[PDB]
Design an enzyme around this catalytic site. Structure first.
Site, short mmCIF file in Angstrom:
data_model
loop_
_atom_site.label_atom_id
_atom_site.label_comp_id
_atom_site.label_asym_id
_atom_site.label_seq_id
_atom_site.Cartn_x
_atom_site.Cartn_y
_atom_site.Cartn_z
N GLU A 1 9.05 -0.34 3.34
CA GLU A 1 7.40 -0.49 2.34
C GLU A 1 6.32 -0.67 3.75
O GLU A 1 6.42 -1.47 4.52
CB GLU A 1 7.50 -1.42 1.64
CG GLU A 1 7.88 -2.41 0.93
CD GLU A 1 8.13 -2.93 0.11
OE1 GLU A 1 7.92 -4.70 -0.37
OE2 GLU A 1 8.24 -2.36 -1.16
N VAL A 2 5.07 -0.27 3.12
CA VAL A 2 3.70 -0.33 3.71
C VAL A 2 2.55 -1.50 2.97
O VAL A 2 2.93 -1.65 2.32
CB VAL A 2 3.05 1.09 4.31
CG1 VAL A 2 1.90 0.50 5.51
CG2 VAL A 2 4.11 2.02 4.32
N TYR B 1 -5.15 0.80 11.03
CA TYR B 1 -5.10 0.82 8.92
C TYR B 1 -5.93 1.74 8.35
O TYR B 1 -6.61 1.76 8.74
CB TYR B 1 -5.67 -0.23 8.33
CG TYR B 1 -5.67 -0.33 6.80
CD1 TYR B 1 -4.84 -0.34 5.27
CD2 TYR B 1 -7.52 -0.49 6.32
CE1 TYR B 1 -5.29 -0.87 4.25
CE2 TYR B 1 -7.56 -0.67 5.07
CZ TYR B 1 -7.17 -0.63 4.02
OH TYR B 1 -6.41 -0.75 2.78
N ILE C 1 0.59 -1.31 -0.08
CA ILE C 1 0.25 -0.48 0.13
C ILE C 1 1.03 1.66 -0.36
O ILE C 1 0.63 2.34 -0.51
CB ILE C 1 -1.26 -0.30 1.56
CG1 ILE C 1 0.02 -0.25 2.23
CG2 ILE C 1 -1.65 -1.34 0.72
CD1 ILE C 1 -0.97 0.31 3.67
N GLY C 2 2.41 1.18 0.21
CA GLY C 2 3.35 1.85 0.25
C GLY C 2 4.22 1.86 0.19
O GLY C 2 5.01 0.68 0.73
N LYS C 3 5.18 3.42 0.14
CA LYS C 3 6.82 2.78 0.38
C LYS C 3 7.16 4.42 0.89
O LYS C 3 6.67 5.07 0.00
CB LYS C 3 7.37 2.03 -0.80
CG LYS C 3 8.09 3.25 -2.28
CD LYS C 3 7.74 3.12 -2.64
CE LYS C 3 8.01 2.98 -4.28
NZ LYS C 3 7.57 4.14 -4.83
N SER D 1 11.18 6.87 2.33
CA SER D 1 12.65 6.59 2.29
C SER D 1 12.89 4.71 3.26
O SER D 1 13.49 4.17 2.90
CB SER D 1 13.57 7.43 3.25
N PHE D 2 12.41 4.47 4.28
CA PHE D 2 12.92 3.41 5.00
C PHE D 2 12.49 1.82 4.81
O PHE D 2 13.11 1.39 4.58
CB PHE D 2 12.46 3.64 6.19
N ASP E 1 7.04 16.73 10.09
CA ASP E 1 6.84 16.43 8.86
C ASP E 1 5.49 16.39 8.54
O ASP E 1 5.01 14.81 7.97
CB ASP E 1 6.84 15.32 8.86
CG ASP E 1 7.07 15.05 7.00
OD1 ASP E 1 7.38 15.87 6.56
OD2 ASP E 1 8.02 14.22 6.88
#
Length: 277
Positions: free
Chosen positions: A18-19, A80, A11-13, A15-16, A123
């Site tokens: 991925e999600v 979530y 569902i995402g990425k 820097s660190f 942020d």
């Protein structure tokens, strides 16, 4: 391994790592799983993410269920949010002032919790604002979150996303929660316009334009209170920006913000748009 959870779609990425979407195989609730391979450099900023998340308890901040270790992969388990980012929700077209006000109020409520807990998010962009399928608005990504203590009254670290960064933090000046107020003012602009000021330029150019120029303003066909809300947040002097609590009672918020369930609509507009390409 960490097999209380089954991975779903990515569902995402950032820097660190991925999600992922996932499920807790003990309660069948849908969860969000940050996964990080610990083989290399940013690890101290990974620790601070979980250490803050663990210490946060608010319906305006993404909950935390724990971290696990599978070989080298680190699995951070968190609430979530199926509406996804406010940023993605902007894509289809402009928002109206009620939608803007409503989302901001929920950020404002969130920031108030953090800042009362001596925590600066460091942020705030529409990207890190996530919406639950029913429209609840919560803050995410505490990768760069900073901690004020009774001793450390201010932070100095250069951190954040350039466009949403406060002059004082770019300039390594001693800063506090007020930095987030500035970001929220840029986030206010973002929400109203779909893009933060300077977004056409390279982030380096921006890092001298923020401190040198005077604050951005909200130009266009927006009501005075909205414009003033931005004007109020975007002040070069930290101490003359209002606190989240104070901005919660600001006029623009109070006259335009309605039930957060009316945000199911914004989430729909995205779904209809995203499925159409």
């Amino acid at each position: 391994p960490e097999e209380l959870f089954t991975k779903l779609e990515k569902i995402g990425k950032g820097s660190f790592g991925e999600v992922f979407k996932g499920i807790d195989n003990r309660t069948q609730k849908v969860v969000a799983i940050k996964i990080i391979d610990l083989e290399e450099d940013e690890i101290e900023d990974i620790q601070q993410e979980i250490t803050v998340l663990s210490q946060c308890d608010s319906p305006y901040v993404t909950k935390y269920y724990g971290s696990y270790l599978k070989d080298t992969k680190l699995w951070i388990i968190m609430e979530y949010l199926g509406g996804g980012s406010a940023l993605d929700l902007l894509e289809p077209g402009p928002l109206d002032e009620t939608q803007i006000a409503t989302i901001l109020r929920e950020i404002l409520k969130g920031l108030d919790y953090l800042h009362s807990e001596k925590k600066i998010h460091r942020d705030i962009k529409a990207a890190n604002v996530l919406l639950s399928e029913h429209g609840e608005v919560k803050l995410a990504d505490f990768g760069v979150a900073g901690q004020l203590t009774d001793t450390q009254i201010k932070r100095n670290t250069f951190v954040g996303t350039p466009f949403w960064m406060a002059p004082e933090v770019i300039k390594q000046s001693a800063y506090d929660s007020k930095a987030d107020i500035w970001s929220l003012g840029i986030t206010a602009i973002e929400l109203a316009r779909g893009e933060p000021p300077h977004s056409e330029l390279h982030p380096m150019k921006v890092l001298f334009l923020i401190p040198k120029n005077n604050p951005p303003t909200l130009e266009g066909n927006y009501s005075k209170p909205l414009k003033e809300f931005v004007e109020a947040c975007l002040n070069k002097e930290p101490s003359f920006r209002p606190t989240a609590k104070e901005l919660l009672k600001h006029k623009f918020i109070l006259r335009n913000a309605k039930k957060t369930s009316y945000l199911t609509e914004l989430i729909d507009r995205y779904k209809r748009w995203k499925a159409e390409q």
